[PDB]
Curated annotation (Swiss-Prot), chain A:
Source species of the chain: Homo sapiens (Human)
GO biological process, one term: protein refolding
Subunit structure: Component of the chaperone-assisted selective autophagy (CASA) complex consisting of BAG3, HSPA8/HSC70, HSPB8 and STUB1/CHIP. Identified in a IGF2BP1-dependent mRNP granule complex containing untranslated mRNAs. Interacts with PACRG. Interacts with HSPH1/HSP105. Interacts with IRAK1BP1 and BAG1. Interacts with DNAJC7. Interacts with DNAJB12 (via J domain). Interacts with DNAJB14 (via J domain). Interacts (via C-terminus) with the E3 ligase CHIP forming a 210 kDa complex of one CHIP and two HSPA8 molecules. (Microbial infection) Interacts with SV40 VP1.
Taxonomic path: Eukaryota, Metazoa, Chordata, Craniata, Vertebrata
Protein name: Heat shock cognate 71 kDa protein
Keywords: Acetylation, ATP-binding, Autophagy, Cell membrane, Chaperone, Cytoplasm, Host-virus interaction, Hydrolase, Isopeptide bond, Lysosome, Membrane, Methylation, mRNA processing, mRNA splicing, Nucleotide-binding, Nucleus, Phosphoprotein, Repressor, Spliceosome, Stress response, Transcription, Transcription regulation, Ubl conjugation
GO CC terms: blood microparticle; clathrin-sculpted gamma-aminobutyric acid transport vesicle membrane; cytoplasm; cytosol; extracellular exosome; extracellular region; extracellular space; ficolin-1-rich granule lumen
Keyword Zinc attributed: no
Region (Interaction with BAG1): 181-372
Entry-annotated residues carrying N6-acetyllysine: 103, 241, 314, 323
Record localization: Cytoplasm; Melanosome; Nucleus, Nucleolus; Cell membrane
UniProtKB/Swiss-Prot annotation, chain B:
Lineage: Eukaryota, Viridiplantae, Streptophyta, Embryophyta, Tracheophyta
Location of the BAG domain: 95-173
Assembly description: Binds to the ATPase domain of HSP70/HSC70 chaperones.
Organism this protein belongs to: Arabidopsis thaliana
The protein's name in its UniProt record: BAG family molecular chaperone regulator 1
Single GO term (MF): protein-folding chaperone binding
Gene giving rise to this polypeptide: BAG1
Ubiquitin-like domain location: 1-76
Length: 376, 177
């Protein structure tokens, strides 16, 4: 049996074998797989192959399905999100469905149907690894999901040919990965700080003799690493203007290139104090050979970074807890690799050491897989 | 043949050698009278460390030229460091060559698009679009390659190939709409 982190932009699958969890790489060798389904006139792609031809086929490549699951077409947030997604969303008796062109025809899919397709792939990734069919699974969802959202996610599993042993919360999955429930004795308060996959979630749990309870959730559904890339992009757009009196912002090809280079630079700045950027002939034949210090990156994001403590404070208050009552702090999500994020959080917890040794993209599936093994 | 005089400590050793030899052969000829393995020899000529791969005559070495020999007990560390740079320079260069071959093939399609048009035919806007994005993908691959010197010149020329093919495709699209 397997645990699957069904994520908003990427998903991850783990399997507990020989007394240990293995996180499973897909065909391209990647331990996470884009939650993307693309439709063409000939076929249907899922995962990396879908994300790879997105610029090619943008209005027929579906993603972010998790933001629709259990929602009403009416929801302000849905109507708002629709203006940004290139694919369509139509109303089916109050319910949202994504709408695309598939093999020449117009087809529409419930958010859960798109998720069942991502799940099938995560299933197949594991099966491919085990050489044996996979029938049982634990699948995770955000703590704030309601019973409707949970059920839809379960149905997605069911359609994908999975018996969903249980739907558990992502923060809970993460705490499990770190063995926090096995820290025996008095109840423990755990703060899960999950910054990744285009969302930011802070969760507070209490564990008592291995029983989990969610005390409070807070965060920002539209804050993630892309915000940080954007500040870097705009910074460099400005730099080009101060250096060549030209504004590249309208040339989509140039922005795409600078954006992509900025994404790379950001990751490099997580482990180095400076990054170099080189884009040959960026705009009107003008090369762009420059660089950026971690310090300057932090400055450009100073407000965004600081602001992640606001949901931390809201979550504490709503749990009726002072920072000092938190026994365990857990870092999950790709963006928690940013040093300035880690520092801001530790400092806010007066120096307390963070649980972070587990790959932040994998901790959730890791916890899911542990649980799946227990439940089977 | 030529006489090279290598100082090692206070002892000078004279080595008769052909001026076409590499510094590596000179080092090998030195192992005898000095006891130092060739891989462990640092040879200094005119205040410059000489790579074993470099050749004497090209390097200025003449009859009666003076050099200094220094033993390096940490040569292996230095060999692996150098191999690492060489390997990285090669990988980047080959990465650009592979892209260059893909650019040839996409350019093959652009040129065929031009011919078709010139010859009274019509190419579907969709096919022009596809090749533009296939080309953008190759551009993005190029931007990913860290390079300096000749390898960067290589990278930049492939970028220019790509941008030219795209400018053409753009011209075709405009012509047909």
């Amino acid at each position: 049996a397997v645990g699957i982190d069904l994520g908003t932009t990427y998903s991850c699958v783990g399997v507990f074998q020989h007394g240990k969890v293995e996180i499973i790489a897909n065909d391209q060798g990647n331990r996470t797989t884009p939650s993307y389904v693309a439709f063409t006139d000939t076929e249907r792609l899922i995962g990396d192959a879908a994300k790879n031809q997105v610029a090619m086929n943008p209005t027929n490549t579906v993603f972010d399905a998790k933001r629709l699951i259990g929602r009403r077409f009416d929801d302000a947030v849905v109507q708002s999100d629709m203006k940004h997604w290139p694919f369509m969303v139509v109303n089916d008796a109050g319910r949202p469905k994504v709408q695309v062109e598939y093999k020449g025809e117009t087809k529409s899919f419930y958010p859960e149907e798109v998720s069942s397709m991502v799940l099938t792939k995560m299933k197949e990734i594991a099966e491919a690894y085990l050489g044996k069919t996979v029938t049982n699974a634990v699948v995770t969802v955000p703590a704030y999901f309601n019973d409707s959202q949970r059920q839809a996610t379960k149905d997605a599993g069911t359609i994908a040919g999975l018996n969903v042993l249980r739907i558990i919360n992502e923060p809970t999955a993460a705490a499990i990965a770190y063995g926090l429930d096995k820290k025996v004795g008095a109840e423990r308060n755990v703060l899960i700080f999950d910054l990744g996959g285009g969302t930011f979630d802070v969760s507070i749990l209490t564990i008592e003799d291995g029983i989990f309870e969610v005390k409070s959730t807070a965060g920002d559904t539209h804050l993630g690493g892309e915000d940080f890339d954007n500040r870097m992009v705009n910074h460099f757009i400005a730099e080009f203007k101060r250096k060549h009196k030209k504004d590249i912002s309208e040339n989509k090809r140039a922005v795409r290139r600078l954006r992509t280079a900025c994404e790379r630079a950001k990751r490099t700045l997580s482990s180095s104090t400076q990054a170099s950027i080189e884009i040959d002939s960026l705009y009107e034949g003008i090369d762009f050979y420059t660089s950026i210090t971690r310090a300057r990156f932090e400055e450009l994001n100073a407000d965004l970074f600081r602001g992640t403590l606001d949901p931390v404070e809201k979550a504490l208050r709503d749990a009726k807890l002072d920072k000092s009552q938190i026994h365990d702090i857990v870092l999950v999500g790709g963006s928690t690799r940013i040093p300035k994020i880690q520092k801001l959080l530790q400092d806010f917890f007066n120096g307390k050491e963070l649980n972070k040794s587990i790959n932040p993209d994998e901790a959730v599936a890791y916890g899911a897989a542990v649980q799946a093994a227990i439940l089977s | 043949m030529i006489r090279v005089r290598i100082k090692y400590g206070a002892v000078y050793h004279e080595i008769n050698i052909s001026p076409q030899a590499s510094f590596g052969e000179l080092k090998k000829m030195l192992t005898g009278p000095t006891g130092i393995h060739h891989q462990d020899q640092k040879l200094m000529y005119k205040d410059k460390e000489r790579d074993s791969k470099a050749f004497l005559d090209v390097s200025g070495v003449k009859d009666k030229s003076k050099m200094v020999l220094i033993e390096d007990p940490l040569s292996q560390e230095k060999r692996f460091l150098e191999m690492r740079k060489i390997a990285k320079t090669e990988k980047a260069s080959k990465a650009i060559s592979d892209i260059s071959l893909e650019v040839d093939r996409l350019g093959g399609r652009v040129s065929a698009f031009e011919m078709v048009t010139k010859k009274g035919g019509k190419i579907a806007e969709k096919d022009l679009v596809t090749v533009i994005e296939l080309l953008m993908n190759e551009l993005i691959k190029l931007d990913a390659i860290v390079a300096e010197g000749d390898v960067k010149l290589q990278r930049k020329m492939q970028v220019k190939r790509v941008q030219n093919y795209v400018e053409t495709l753009d011209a075709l699209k405009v012509k047909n709409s």
